[PDB]
Amino acid sequence: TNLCPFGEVFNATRFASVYAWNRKRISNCVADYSVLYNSASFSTFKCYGVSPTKLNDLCFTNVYADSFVIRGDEVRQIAPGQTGKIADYNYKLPDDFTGCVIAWNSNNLDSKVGGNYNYLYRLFRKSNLKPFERDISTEIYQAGSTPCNGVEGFNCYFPLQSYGFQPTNGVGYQPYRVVVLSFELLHAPATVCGP
Amino acid sequence: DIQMTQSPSSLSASVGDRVTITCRASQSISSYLNWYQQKPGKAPKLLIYAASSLQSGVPSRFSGSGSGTDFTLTISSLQPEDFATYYCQQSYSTPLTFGGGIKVDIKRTVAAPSVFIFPPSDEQLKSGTASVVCLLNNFYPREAKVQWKVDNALQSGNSQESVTEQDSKDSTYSLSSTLTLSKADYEKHKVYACEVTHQGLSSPVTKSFNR
Amino acid sequence: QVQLQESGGGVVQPGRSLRLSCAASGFTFSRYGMHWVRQAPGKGLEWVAVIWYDGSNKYYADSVKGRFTISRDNSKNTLYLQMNSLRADDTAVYYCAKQEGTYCSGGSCYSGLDYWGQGTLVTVSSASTKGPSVFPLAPSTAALGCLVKDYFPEPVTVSWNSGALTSGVHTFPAVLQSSGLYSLSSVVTVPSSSLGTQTYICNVNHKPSNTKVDKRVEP
Amino acid sequence: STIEEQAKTFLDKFNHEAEDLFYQSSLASWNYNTNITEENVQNMNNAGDKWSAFLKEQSTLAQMYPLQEIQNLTVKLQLQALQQNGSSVLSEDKSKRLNTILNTMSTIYSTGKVCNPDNPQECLLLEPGLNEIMANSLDYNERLWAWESWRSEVGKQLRPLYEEYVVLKNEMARANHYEDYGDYWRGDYEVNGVDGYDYSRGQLIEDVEHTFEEIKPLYEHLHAYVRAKLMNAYPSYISPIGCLPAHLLGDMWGRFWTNLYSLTVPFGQKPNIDVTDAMVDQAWDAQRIFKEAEKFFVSVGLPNMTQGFWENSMLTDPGNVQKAVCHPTAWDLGKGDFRILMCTKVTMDDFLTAHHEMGHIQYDMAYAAQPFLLRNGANEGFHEAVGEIMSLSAATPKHLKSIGLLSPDFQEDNETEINFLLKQALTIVGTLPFTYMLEKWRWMVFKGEIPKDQWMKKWWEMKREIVGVVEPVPHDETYCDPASLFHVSNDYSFIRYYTRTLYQFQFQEALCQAAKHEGPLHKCDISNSTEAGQKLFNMLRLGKSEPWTLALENVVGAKNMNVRPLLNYFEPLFTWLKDQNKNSFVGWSTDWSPYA
Ligand SMILES: *[C@@H]1O[C@H](CO)[C@@H](O)[C@H](O)[C@H]1NC(C)=O
Ligand SMILES: *[C@@H]1O[C@H](CO)[C@@H](O)[C@H](O)[C@H]1NC(C)=O
Ligand SMILES: *[C@@H]1O[C@H](CO)[C@@H](O)[C@H](O)[C@H]1NC(C)=O
Ligand SMILES: *[C@@H]1O[C@H](CO)[C@@H](O)[C@H](O)[C@H]1NC(C)=O
Ligand SMILES: [Zn+2]
């Protein structure tokens, strides 16, 4: 009878970039989903496939918690069937996705005077990503018909670009921490019940 | 490609100790490494994925750590069912490469082998081929050297050897060596010897027979 | 009750083709990537080919590139491998592996292998089926035994005195000769006092040839 | 990969770094303006230098994509805006000479002063002493002396510099595949590559002339009324048929006739509406005024100001030691940052300027979703019109009656309406022929139809037969009086003040149709009407992504500049003027001069 640790995902001192979002496993827990949904401290809380309204009586094999940080206008992009730079090059969700998406403001923690440029996103890629695909390549992007020879000159760009977060920006340009909960149900252990 | 190296290729340990296994790479793979067990004649099954994450159902004593190019795995407790061979796999980019493999055995006091020799029977000689058998019984460890001499001439490329698994009663090894020759070559010489070099013997032991 | 079962193994002559299948039960097949692993007799594991969850990208090892083709039929919940231009280096046990995690499972649709099959043995050789030849190894404590030579394919079962003799009995693994046939030796150690009084007979049974040979060891 | 794809990728990267660089520059500018300090000046200069360097490098890079290979309009517009060579077409020495000339003329205009006779130490600039003389004093001798002093001690200095400025500007112009510098100014209204919305560089002249021909009768009647009143004020210095002296028109250049209101008020015993005293009685502050403006903008359906607006804007003068510019300004810093810089007092004029600046802010918020290079008004005459229609709507007596500033027992009379209309016309109508004249004269000077040795001879010619003005003292060719004006010596286009004046009257009227207003157009109030707000927002959200004709059509329904709304607005005053001028003359004499 041990409760799930969500102080390691939500109460995390450091979050990950959108192109390098972090993932952790939760198992053998008494996780209750009513506490988070009834905390009155989260801006966005949307669940697809399952309903959060007192459905904390389900068992699953495993729980995947995926955390990262984006800007406000991109928070709507973390959803099935969404399009954009983040949705196509950084983070992707399956069309038949079942799970929950939680998002809360982080201006008071992830914004700095003069610009905090520690968060990066991929701007160019040869093709879109697959669901749950994580790319950390640094190969330069050839926008022309000539080889770039590994240098960033004309029609040769660095595919990764850094966000600029300042406390005086609007809510659409402020940082926002996003956590996606995904549930796995295999044909044996079902160790994540949380009565 | 990426090459994955595991040294040493064998390990001996006694129940109650602490066991550490190391895997190495040639490029940067971040945290895309996996650890597998395998008992003889059985499917491998997975122990640790993502180089630091355990599996459901495994006893909570295995611990994996490391990032970049070097990774390590720790056992922290030895059990009768914790005796197998372990592998490391990279999952960064194709082609995905396995390691050589490391084997955990039982530590025991050095015991010298018993050496026997068997010349070919006349029944086999009637077919035109002569096989000479050299046998090592109840030794430790697995490492040993066997050589064949025909009239003080070393034999290469005409002998084959086999080793058995550890016995449950006393953890012993046994080795067999077979030397194959034609009947004309067999009748051409008189003295045939098998030489054994082992850690259990202070000097090599040679058993010879005359035709 | 997650299970994987493989089928298609057997004996094939060099230069021919073969096709292996693996069927899964206990999970949604359409959302996972699949791998093939092969282990040669007496050596370590080797990775062969990978196919993604939707079959968009297929990748192969260098040693089998241009000859092996991987595919998946998730409408029938199965995975297929086709082997062409088979040679003697392709004799091994094959495992069909299911990786941990859904879709790309955290990176580039490659992750650790969570579930494995029992594997199928595939042998490539030119030699046909031949009966085993039994020879004695008499002592000269004492040790004696029986040598089984020139048999194909595996395995052969050796018993001592119709199973009455088990203490000190050592059966060694088979070895492959340059001629394409197998040979082993099964031995037993007995006190020298039993020599001349006790009769020792070794029984060798080869199921593929259905051949049983009884050989007595004489001093 | 097709050329358009490289263009799209290049523009994506350009936008990515451009947003951050522009935000940094705007933040530095804001910190300098709200807090003046040499360190702030250095930060602003560094940010501006970085932004200009980035712009020049991106222009050089974009000059490697030929225009013919791009077919998408929103990409071609950005490439065209980034591909303007500008003044970098000639040698560096000529550019340095141009910069020195411009700096010298600006310094002469800014520091040029006149020292009163017999007092070598009491020397006054144009601002504010000469400004006080022009705005308040009506004495003939003092005004003529100030006029002559400014036009002699300044224009004679700036004549040869203006000649060299004309030469260098014409060179930089025709080196850029242009006919001349006037064409360079006129290229802002050019529209190409769109069907049904074309607009050539040559249609502007025809449109301005066509509008002026219809504007002429109202100008004639107002001119006759002002001339009769000036005869009543100046008996022996103005002739029944002659023109008006330029040193008694309330300003220094004849541009605005507002200061003549005290000499031309119809009914001087009925005061105008002033709600300052009611504001002081009801304990109003700047926060209350801006909340009322926000409520007005909410009533029409426009979004309210963000929390950052109320946390970052400067709505009062800090006083104490902190010094800041008090010019009302609306700032769109980028990245969703909108602010207002204003030293608001408890006064009707500031109560209307707040609505003006908030309209600017609303327009800025409207097109925040557009790409970086398309975040601007459709042309140079849209933004000011959008700003001024809000003040027009807010100034009505009904709006002040609906917020408690007007006693419910206040009933309006026709005399006050006539006074208000004449006050409006003195400012709006008067500057319009002056603007037309100045633009025509500069166009001909840059073109070359006016030889230098005839410049002033031509300059005082049109004054007589368009503006209806004769000079009080003859001037030779050593004078360069037009360059004494800010808009000539500082290299600025001046026709935008014409078109804008029309545009607003096309806007408000249309909005007043959405509000279902009944009565005179000058009594219209658009509060509590969501249809007007939606109709405005539809044009506001476009930005520069579309040709200015389409943006104008989105609100007005016509794709050309129109002048009938102005006449409809001023119809009652026109009727009053026609009734007043039955016993006078219409026209002017171009030969009469006060100096004989
Ligand atoms: C996180 O920390 C806050 C701060 O005390 C605490 O109230 C909360 O229970 C913790 N856990 C979660 C899931 O928010
Ligand atoms: C204005 O600038 C001075 C010096 O740069 C500084 O001391 C002061 O705090 C600034 N005022 C504000 C309101 O930031
Ligand atoms: C032009 O490009 C924009 C994106 O930059 C695209 O939205 C638009 O559809 C393109 N124009 C046409 C006619 O497709
Ligand atoms: C603006 O109006 C919205 C209602 O849509 C309200 O939620 C918000 O608090 C208002 N903001 C301010 C600064 O009054
Ligand atoms: Zn304005």
DSSP D445-462: HHHTSS-GGGHHHHHHHH
Q: Is residue B4 part of a domain?
A: no
* B56–A136 CB contact, under 8 Å: no
> Which residues are within 8 A (CB) of D49 and not within 5 positions of it... i.e. 6 or more apart?
none
Backbone phi, then psi, for D290, in 5-degree steps?
-70, -30
Q: Which helix (H) or strand (E) holds A178?
A: strand A175-184
Nearest CB to D336; choose among A123, A161, A170: A170
Q: Which of B26, B45, B41, B38 shows the shortest CA–CA distance to C112?
A: B45
* C103–A131 CB contact, under 8 Å: yes
Residue A120's domain comprises 115-166
Q: Which is it for strands D113-115 and C175-176: parallel, antiparallel or unpaired?
A: unpaired
Q: Is residue B30 part of a domain?
A: yes
Q: Tell me the three state secondary structure of residue C78.
A: strand
Query: How many CB atoms within 10 Å of residue D92?
Result: 8
Gap from CA of D330 to ligand 5 centroid (Å): 8
Read off the DSSP letter of residue B111: B
Q: Which of residues 54-83 of C touch A (CB under 8 A)?
A: 54
Q: How far apart are CA B139 and CA B118, in angstroms?
A: 19
> Which residue in chain B is spatially nearest to A192 when comparing CA positions?
B56
The tally of CA atoms less than 13 A away on the side-chain side of residue C5 is 6
A14 min Cα distance to partner chain C (Å): 19
Q: How far apart are CA D546 and CA D558, in angstroms?
A: 15
Q: Are residues B63 and B136 in the same domain?
A: no
Residue B135's domain comprises 114-210
Q: Are residues B133 and B75 in the same domain?
A: no
Q: How far apart are CA C74 and CA C54, in angstroms?
A: 9
Please check whether residue C38 is in contact with residue C95, taking contact to mean a CB–CB distance below 8 angstroms: yes
Per the document, the length of chain B is 211
Q: Tell me the three state secondary structure of residue B56.
A: coil
D370 lines ligand 3 (CB under 6 A): no
Nearest CB to C100; choose among B46, B96, B135: B46
Of 2.60.40.420, 3.40.50.720, 2.60.40.10, 1.10.287.1400, the CATH number of C3-124 is 2.60.40.10
Please check whether residue D111 is in contact with residue D126, taking contact to mean a CB–CB distance below 8 angstroms: no
Q: Tell me the three state secondary structure of residue B166.
A: coil
What are the strands of the beta sheet with C78-83, ordered from one edge?
Answer: C3-7, C18-25, C78-83, C68-73
Q: Which helix (H) or strand (E) holds B51?
A: none
* D9–A124 CB contact, under 8 Å: yes
What CATH number does the domain containing B72 carry? 2.60.40.10
Please check whether residue A93 is in contact with residue A78, taking contact to mean a CB–CB distance below 8 angstroms: yes
The tally of CA atoms less than 13 A away on the side-chain side of residue D32 is 17
Count helices and strands in chain A by DSSP H and E runs: 3, 9
Breaks (C-N over 2.5 A) in chain C follow: 140
Q: Which of residues 18-77 of B touch C (CB under 8 A)?
A: 32, 34, 36, 38, 43-46, 49-50, 55
Q: How far apart are CA D247 and CA D470, in angstroms?
A: 10
Where helices occur in D412-495 by DSSP H, the ranges are 414-428, 431-447, 455-462, 486-489
> Which residue in chain B is spatially nearest to C113 when comparing CA positions?
B46
Gap from CA of D13 to ligand 2 centroid (Å): 35
Q: How far apart are CA D157 and CA D479, in angstroms?
A: 9
Q: How far apart are CA B110 and CA B114, in angstroms?
A: 13
Nearest CB to A132; choose among C26, C54, C105: C105
Q: How far apart are CA D481 and CA D463, in angstroms?
A: 13
Q: Which is it for strands A141-142 and D469-470: parallel, antiparallel or unpaired?
A: unpaired
Q: How far apart are CA C102 and CA C109, in angstroms?
A: 9
Beta strands in chain B (DSSP E): 10-13, 20-24, 33-38, 46-49, 53-54, 63-67, 70-74, 85-90, 102-106, 114-118, 129-139, 145-150, 153-154, 159-163, 173-182, 191-197, 205-210
Q: Is residue B20 part of a domain?
A: yes
Class of domain C133-217: mainly beta
Backbone phi, then psi, for D86, in 5-degree steps?
80, -140
Q: Are residues A23 and A94 in the same domain?
A: yes
| Chain A: touching chains (3 or more CB pairs < 8 Å) | B, C, D
D72 lines ligand 3 (CB under 6 A): yes
Q: For residues D261-295, b (16+ Cβ closer than 10 Å) or e, as one string? A: eebbbbeeeeeebebbebbeeeebebeebbebbbe
B161 min Cα distance to partner chain C (Å): 8
Q: How far apart are CA D253 and CA D275, in angstroms?
A: 33
- Topology alike, domains C3-124 and C133-217: yes
Q: Are residues A121 and A183 in the same domain?
A: no
Q: Are residues A68 and A46 in the same domain?
A: yes
Q: Name the residue at shortest CA distance from atom 3 of ligand 4.
A: D304
Q: Which helix (H) or strand (E) holds B168?
A: none
Gap from CA of D304 to ligand 4 centroid (Å): 6
> Which residue in chain C is spatially nearest to A130 when comparing CA positions?
C104
Write the Ramachandran bin of B80: left for phi over 0, alpha for psi from -120 to 50, otherwise beta.
Answer: alpha
Q: Which ligand is nearest to the CA of D291?
A: 4
* D337–A144 CB contact, under 8 Å: no
Q: Which ligand is nearest to the CA of D79?
A: 3
| First-to-final CA distance of chain C | 56
* Domain closes at, from B57, B77, B106: B106
Q: How far apart are CA D368 and CA C85, in angstroms?
A: 64
C170: chain B residues, CB-CB within 8 Å? 137, 164, 174
> Which residues are within 8 A (CB) of B151 and not within 5 positions of it... i.e. 6 or more apart?
B189, B190, B191
Q: How far is CA D239 from the centre of its chain?
A: 33
Residue with tokens 């006092």: C193
Q: Are residues A159 and A177 in the same domain?
A: no
> Which residues are within 8 A (CB) of B117 and not within 5 positions of it... i.e. 6 or more apart?
B132, B133, B134, B135, B194, B207, B208, B209, C140
Q: How far apart are CA D517 and CA B154, in angstroms?
A: 119
Residue D384 marked in a binding site: yes
D74 lines ligand 3 (CB under 6 A): yes
Please check whether residue D125 is in contact with residue D113, taking contact to mean a CB–CB distance below 8 angstroms: yes
A173: chain D residues, CB-CB within 8 Å? 335-336
Q: Are residues A110 and A24 in the same domain?
A: yes
Determine contact: A188 vs chain C, CB below 8 A.
yes
Q: How far apart are CA D469 and CA D462, in angstroms?
A: 9
Q: How far apart are CA D455 and CA D166, in angstroms?
A: 13
Q: Is residue B2 part of a domain?
A: no
Q: Which is it for strands D123-125 and B129-139: parallel, antiparallel or unpaired?
A: unpaired
Backbone phi, then psi, for C154, in 5-degree steps?
-70, 155
> A with C: how many residue pairs have Cβ under 8 Å apart?
44
> Which residue in chain A is spatially nearest to B52 when comparing CA positions?
A24
Reading the block at residue D416, the tokens are 């006050």
Gap from CA of A7 to ligand 1 centroid (Å): 7
Q: Are residues B25 and B99 in the same domain?
A: yes
Q: Which of A79, C173, A3, D211 shows the shortest CA–CA distance to B173?
A: C173
C109 min Cα distance to partner chain A (Å): 7
Q: What is the DSSP string of A137-156?
A: --PPEE-SSS--TT--STTE
A63: chain B residues, CB-CB within 8 Å? none
Number of domains forming the structure of chain B? 2
Q: Residue D547: exposed, middle, or buried by beta-carbon count in 10 A (0-12, 13-18, 19+)?
A: buried
Q: Is residue B1 part of a domain?
A: no
Reading the block at residue B28, the tokens are 């940067």
Q: Is residue B3 part of a domain?
A: no
A45 pairs with which residues across the strands? A102
Sign of CA dihedral D337, D341, D346, D351: negative
Q: For residues D225-248, b (16+ Cβ closer than 10 Å) or e, as one string? A: bbbbebeeebeeebeeebbbbbbb
The tally of CA atoms less than 13 A away on the side-chain side of residue C178 is 7
* D6–A143 CB contact, under 8 Å: yes
Q: What is the resolution of this structure in A?
A: 2.2
Q: Are residues A36 and A46 in the same domain?
A: yes
Q: How far is CA D345 from the centre of its chain?
A: 23
Q: How far apart are CA A9 and CA A68, in angstroms?
A: 10
Reading the block at residue B134, the tokens are 């050299």
> Which residue in chain A is spatially nearest to B57 when comparing CA positions?
A189
Residue type, A46: K
Q: Which is it for strands D469-470 and D244-245: parallel, antiparallel or unpaired?
A: parallel
Q: How far apart are CA C144 and CA C196, in angstroms?
A: 13
Please check whether residue B196 is in contact with residue B205, taking contact to mean a CB–CB distance below 8 angstroms: yes
Q: How far apart are CA D327 and CA D333, in angstroms?
A: 17
D308: chain A residues, CB-CB within 8 Å? 168-170
* Domain closes at, from B76, B106, B136: B106
Q: Which ligand is nearest to the CA of D9?
A: 3
Reading the block at residue D49, the tokens are 């230098």
Please check whether residue C3 is in contact with residue C25, taking contact to mean a CB–CB distance below 8 angstroms: yes
Where in the sequence numbering do the catalytic residues of D fall?
A: 357, 487
* B100–C44 CB contact, under 8 Å: yes
Gap from CA of D306 to ligand 4 centroid (Å): 8
Q: How far is CA D147 from the centre of its chain?
A: 24
Q: Are residues B133 and B95 in the same domain?
A: no
* D20–A115 CB contact, under 8 Å: yes
Please check whether residue D572 is in contact with residue D418, taking contact to mean a CB–CB distance below 8 angstroms: yes
Residue D255 marked in a binding site: yes
Q: What residue segments make up the domains of chain C, in order of their start?
A: 3-124, 133-217
Task: Point out the ligand 2 atom lying closest to the alpha carbon of residue D35.
Answer: 1
Where helices occur in A82-172 by DSSP H, the ranges are 85, 107-110
Q: Which ligand is nearest to the CA of D309?
A: 4
Among C51, C64, C140, C202, the strongest candidate for a mutation testing the B interface, having the largest count of B CBs within 10 A, is C140
Q: How far is CA D492 from the centre of its chain?
A: 11
Q: Are residues B121 and B82 in the same domain?
A: no
Nearest CB to B96; choose among C110, C170, C184: C110
D337: chain A residues, CB-CB within 8 Å? 168-170
Gap from CA of D384 to ligand 5 centroid (Å): 5
Number of domains forming the structure of chain A? 2
Dihedral (Cα; A11, A12, A15, A21), 10-degree rounding = -90
D307 lines ligand 4 (CB under 6 A): yes
D and B adjacent (3 or more CB pairs under 8 angstroms): no
Q: Which of D524, D529, D531, D527 shows the shortest CA–CA distance to D504?
A: D524
Reading the block at residue D568, the tokens are 């409809």
Q: How far apart are CA D309 and CA D331, in angstroms?
A: 11
Gap from CA of D557 to ligand 5 centroid (Å): 24
* Domain closes at, from B81, B106, B131: B106
Q: Are residues B70 and B17 in the same domain?
A: yes
Determine contact: A191 vs chain B, CB below 8 A.
yes
Read off the DSSP letter of residue A66: E
Q: Tell me the three state secondary structure of residue D126.
A: helix
D295, D296, D302, D304: residue to mutate for ligand 4 pocket, most atoms within 8 A of CB: D304
Q: Which of D158, D144, D23, D21 shows the shortest CA–CA distance to D103?
A: D158
Q: Which of D181, D186, D182 shows the shortest CA–CA distance to D170?
A: D181
Q: Are residues B124 and B66 in the same domain?
A: no
| Chain D: touching chains (3 or more CB pairs < 8 Å) | A
